[PDB]
Design a binder for this molecule. Structure first.
Ligand SMILES: C=C1C[C@@]23CC[C@H]4[C@@](C)(CCC[C@@]4(C)C(=O)O[C@@H]4O[C@H](CO)[C@@H](O)[C@H](O)[C@H]4O)[C@@H]2CC[C@]1(O[C@@H]1O[C@H](CO)[C@@H](O)[C@H](O)[C@H]1O)C3
Ligand code: NA
Length: 403
């Protein structure tokens, strides 16, 4: 009857929330098409109820779109190229799908990542309403729209121009879905919502057996995962390893193959690393691990969705920055939400070990765990029938029908 088209940005903290949004909407009775680049294409057999359609970089990519690291900060150069060049092809794919539409179905709206600001005038050209998904925090929006990091950004010409384009095309959209809940960022709400005429909807999107974990005492394991796009130099990998050892905590460390530049997997690890404490794996399902009673803390990339998934399960964090990430976001988590510790000095064994001990062992760290557990309760209540997130979602579903 009603189909929604979703068009995510193809990177860690963008894909997952858009897919989760797809699942929510599927469960409210919408059919789902996902438009996605061939680059970082998700695993489609894991979402058999969605139609996937690959666009924008099909077979003959040709140019620099064909070059370009697949990992680290420069991978994202794909995004400005598509914002600049992708309009006519996005338009064609939208038309092809409307032409093949079955007689009993229609397309309700297009939902894009906010970073895909080019999509607004394309949607407008076809008389299709576009909603936007903000995959990151309300605070992040507030900090850029209105002290040291703010002046770092005022010095950054590309960052500022992209942000102005995002902002204008978000305001022009028919609605904004934020990956958050009201009780998490209650001071940001009024100000952010108000700056944007398009109606806002806050929905916290993050809401199998581990034999080795099952044998560990509660809150005894450090879970370490930097996600799918990140990379480090060999020196940094070794400092991460030295830090884990010196913490003397038990750890489950997820290391993607390719995470260490210049090696397939973990060749640089010293002989007899691991011992009786550590476990290393290539991949695990993160939400499931975070829900396990063995996990005492989560050392993560400072991405917002990772962070939200952790507080939604009551797990405190250690935060590391990668690529072009601004310290802003980990500061907010550390110093305002107070649900983890930020590593200020890159990768250094002493700081690493201290942060692990602070969150997992130290008496004076327990406030952090507690803060995390309060947030988890609030998330639970918000999603409760009657709660603010439950009602936001119900209103969005009805609004989509009214477009
Ligand atoms: C206000 C914002 C607009 C903004 C839009 C994306 C954009 C860029 C980062 C500028 C460069 C090109 C481009 C396209 C870029 O490289 O984008 C990055 O591409 C990576 C893949 O190489 C992805 O992994 C990252 O998610 C993506 O940011 C730009 C400026 C700063 C930025 O805020 C940042 O927002 C982030 C939250 O969204 C927050 O984590 C950062 O701390 C914060 O500084 C983001
Ligand atoms: Na061992």
């Amino acid at each position: 009857r009603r189909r929604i088209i979703l068009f995510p940005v193809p990177f860690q903290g963008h894909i997952n929330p858009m897919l989760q949004l797809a699942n929510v909407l599927y469960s409210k009775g919408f059919s789902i098409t996902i438009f996605h680049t061939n680059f970082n294409k998700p695993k489609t057999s894991n979402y058999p109820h969605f139609t996937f359609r690959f666009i924008l970089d099909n077979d003959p990519q040709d140019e620099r779109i064909s070059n370009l690291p697949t990992h680290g900060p420069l991978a994202g150069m794909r995004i400005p190229i598509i914002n600049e060049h992708g309009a006519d092809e996005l338009r064609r794919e939208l038309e092809l799908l409307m032409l093949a539409s079955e007689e009993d179905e229609e397309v309700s709206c297009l939902i894009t990542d906010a970073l895909w600001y080019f999509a607004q005038s394309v949607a407008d050209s076809l008389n299709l309403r576009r909603l936007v998904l903000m995959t990151s925090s309300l605070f992040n929006f507030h900090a850029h729209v209105s002290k040291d990091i703010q002046f770092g950004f005022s010095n950054w010409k590309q960052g500022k121009e992209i942000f102005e384009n995002i902002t204008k095309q978000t305001k022009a959209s028919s609605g904004v879905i934020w990956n958050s809940f009201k009780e998490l960022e209650e001071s940001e709400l009024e100000t952010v919502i108000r700056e944007i005429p398009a109606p806002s909807f806050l929905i916290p999107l993050p809401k199998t057996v581990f034999p080795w974990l099952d044998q560990q005492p509660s809150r005894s394991v450090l879970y370490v995962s930097f996600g799918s796009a990140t990379e480090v130099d060999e020196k940094d990998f070794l400092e991460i390893a030295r830090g884990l050892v010196d913490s003397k905590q038990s750890f489950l460390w997820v290391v993607r193959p390719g995470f260490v530049k210049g090696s397939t997997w973990v060749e640089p690890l010293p002989d007899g690393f691991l011992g009786e404490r550590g476990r290393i794996v290539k991949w695990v399902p993160q939400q499931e691990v975070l829900a396990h009673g063995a996990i005492g803390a989560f050392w993560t990339h400072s991405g917002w969705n990772s962070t939200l998934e952790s507080v939604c399960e009551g797990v405190p964090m250690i935060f590391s920055d990668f690529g072009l990430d601004q310290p802003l976001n980990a500061r907010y988590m550390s110093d305002v939400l107070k649900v983890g510790v930020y590593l200020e000095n890159g990768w250094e064994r002493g700081e690493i070990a201290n942060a692990i001990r602070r969150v997992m062992v130290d008496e004076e760290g327990e406030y952090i765990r507690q803060n995390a557990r309060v947030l988890k309760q609030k998330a639970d209540v918000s999603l409760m029938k009657g709660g603010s997130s439950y009602e936001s979602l119900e209103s969005l579903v009805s609004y989509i029908s009214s477009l």
